[PDB]
């Protein structure tokens, strides 16, 4: 069985970054020629692994994380980065062993009047831990007076909407991001490249 890479990369809809999707890849053969031949990726960088040898290596388990962010925020999907995405939406660990793949998606996630169905977390007291997902929608308290579930001054909804319009700049345009995590534990390898077993 080949690894399910079309369902992650060819997916008709991606998840919001605050509620990023994680798909477990296991017990399959992984051919990365699907990503090699396609010249649409703006970012293809790997950590602890070279991107060219991925067809020669095997892993015990592979995780595939996917979401949509701005082009100006793609650089925050990397170890040791800071920002609203890295601190409150998606935090890669400093010992991250895997790959980060991103491509422009203005043709798929932009609407004329504005696509407001993609959200990021704007308000949070503390920074996220590595590989942490916060799906909470509780009203954020910016002052000393409790909100009691009511929006107002110093009482705001924690999630915000991207404004994704086709006439936006490349920094404001939507980018689809796939994060591949690799683990090598003392366990049988489930995901292998075609060059290997």
């Amino acid at each position: 069985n080949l690894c399910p890479f079309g369902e992650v990369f060819n997916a008709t809809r991606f998840a919001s970054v605050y509620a990023w999707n994680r798909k477990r890849i296991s017990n399959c053969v992984a051919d990365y020629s699907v990503l090699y031949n396609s010249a649409s990726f703006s970012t293809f960088k790997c950590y602890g692994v070279s991107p060219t040898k991925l067809n020669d290596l095997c892993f015990t388990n592979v995780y595939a994380d996917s979401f949509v962010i701005r082009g100006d925020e793609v650089r925050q999907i990397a170890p040791g980065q800071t920002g609203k995405i890295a601190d409150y939406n998606y935090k890669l660990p400093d010992d991250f062993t895997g790959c980060v793949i991103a491509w422009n998606s203005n043709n798929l996630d932009s609407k004329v009047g504005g696509n407001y169905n993609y959200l990021y977390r704007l308000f949070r007291k503390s920074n996220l831990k590595p590989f942490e997902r916060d799906i909470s929608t509780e009203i954020y308290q910016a002052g000393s007076t409790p909100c009691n579930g009511v929006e107002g001054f110093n009482c705001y909804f924690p999630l915000q909407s991207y404004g994704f319009q086709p006439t936006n700049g490349v920094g404001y345009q939507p980018y689809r991001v796939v994060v591949l995590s690799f683990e090598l534990l003392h366990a049988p390898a489930t995901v292998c490249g075609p060059k290997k077993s």
Partner: nanobody, 124 residues
Framework: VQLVESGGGLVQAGESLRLSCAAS????????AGWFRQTPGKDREFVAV????????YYADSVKGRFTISRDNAKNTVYLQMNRLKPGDTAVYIC????????????????????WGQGTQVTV
């Protein structure tokens, strides 16, 4: 994570110098390590880059055949053996650490890296 450069000073033409960039964390082995120089007044300029495994390297044409890059992940340090130094090489050399890119052209851009350092002033 901190990046500290060392091994800089005053030298003359023809003479050699070796630069080092130590890493605070043992995660240095998973990143690609590159070297940049910012001559005072100008902007950053690429010099060299080494990948995490060391099985692939890329130099700039200005220092190709004169400089050499190496790394030792046990000490979490990059090396830049600078030979045949000319007065134009006088600059603060900064070491950058980021991802291993499928397209090697991304190493030439400074914005494609993640960590940066303080810099060490080399004078020829």
């Amino acid at each position: 994570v901190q990046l500290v450069e060392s091994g800089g000073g005053l030298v003359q033409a023809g003479e050699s110098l070796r630069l080092s960039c130590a890493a605070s964390k043992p995660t240095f082995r998973n990143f690609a390590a590159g070297w940049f120089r910012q001559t005072p007044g100008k902007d950053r300029e690429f010099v060299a880059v080494i990948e995490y495994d060391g099985d692939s390297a890329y130099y700039a044409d200005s220092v190709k055949g004169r400089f050499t890059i190496s790394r030792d992940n046990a000490k979490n340090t990059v090396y830049l053996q600078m030979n045949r130094l000319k007065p134009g090489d006088t600059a603060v050399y900064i070491c950058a650490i980021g991802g291993n890119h499928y397209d090697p052209s991304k190493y030439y851009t400074a914005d494609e890296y993640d960590y940066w350092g303080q810099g060490t002033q080399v004078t020829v």
